[PDB]
């Protein structure tokens, strides 16, 4: 899925664009 | 887009930079 490994937040926030409200 | 291991307050704050949608909510451990 996402996170749980390197905490990512680097090459996957384009995905994080759907975390906001 | 540098360094790694952020998800905690970094996917969060960094979200203010990625989403910036008047707020956000991600899943955090514990």
Swiss-Prot record, chain B:
It comes from the Eukaryota. This is Insulin B chain. The gene is INS. The chain holds residues 25 to 54 of 110 of the full protein.
């Amino acid at each position: 899925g996402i996170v749980e490994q390197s905490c990512t937040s680097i090459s996957s926030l384009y995905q994080l664009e759907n975390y906001c409200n | 887009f540098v360094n790694q291991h952020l998800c905690g307050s970094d996917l969060v704050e960094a979200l203010y930079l990625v989403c910036g949608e008047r707020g956000f909510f991600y899943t955090k451990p514990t």
